[PDB]
Amino acid sequence: MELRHLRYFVAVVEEQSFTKAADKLCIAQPPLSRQIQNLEEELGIQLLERGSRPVKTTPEGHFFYQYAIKLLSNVDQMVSMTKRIASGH
Amino acid sequence: MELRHLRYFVAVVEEQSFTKAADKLCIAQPPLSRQIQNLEEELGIQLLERGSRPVKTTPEGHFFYQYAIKLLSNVDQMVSMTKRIASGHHHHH
DNA sequence: TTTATATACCTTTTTAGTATGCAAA
DNA sequence: TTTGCATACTAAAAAGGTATATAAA
C-alpha cells in the first residue's frame, strides 16, 4: 500500500465520484478506478458501494477515510517541519 | 513520495547500511541507493551522512526518521483496525 | 588492501492514457 | 436518453537487477 492509494481514495470520497476526483487530481478516471480496486483487493475489504450514484463509503471505508486524512495531514506536517529544520545552520 | 520510500529509508537508518538494509528488504543495493536519492531530491534536503561509513542520519534526516516510524505504525494500525471492523468483530461502538 | 555505496546500463513491473462497453437513473 | 464506473488495450514511467567505478575504512 502506497500513499497513492490513500491520496486517490480520499479524493474519490471527498468528491463523491471517480470522474470528479480524477479531474481534481488531473489523472484519467480508469487508472484511478484501478488503484481503488487494488487497494480493496489488497485489504480484502470493500470500501465503496457502487451504483449507487453518487458513490458512498461502506462503514469500513468510512473509518478508513477518517484515518487516511489524518495520515495524509501528517505527511504534510512531517515534510514541512523537516524542511523548517533544514533551513537554519 | 510513497510509503515504500519511508520503508526503505527506515531500513537503511536501522541497519546503518545500504547493503544490509537491501538484503533485509529483498532488493539489490543499487535500487535502494537511488530510491533514497530520489526521496532526498524530492524533498530537497539531505537525510543521510555520505562521507562517513557507519551510515548516519543528518539532524533533519533523524527527525524525519522518527516521524516516519510513527507514520508507518499508524498505517498498520489503520489497516489492522479496518480489518477488525470488516470481519465484524468490532469493539468500536 | 577490503568493503561498502554511487553510476551506468538494461530488464521487468507498474501506472497512466485512450477507446469503449455497460449499467444507473 | 444521458452520465459515470468498469474493462481491454497501449504507452509511459518507474522500480528492480547486474556489472563496475569509486571512496571510505
From Swiss-Prot, chain B:
Residues 18-37 bind DNA. It comes from the Bacteria. Residues 1-58 form the HTH lysR-type domain. Homotetramer; dimer of dimers. The dimers can also associate to form linear, higher oligomers (in vitro). Positive regulator of the ben and cat genes for benzoate degradation. BenM is necessary for ben gene expression but not for expression of the cat genes, which can be regulated by CatM. Binds to the inducers cis,cis-muconate and benzoate. Contains a secondary binding site for benzoate in addition to a primary effector binding site that can accommodate either cis,cis-muconate or benzoate. The existence of this secondary binding site may explain the synergistic effects of cis,cis-muconate and benzoate. Belongs to the LysR transcriptional regulatory family. This is HTH-type transcriptional regulator BenM. The gene is benM.
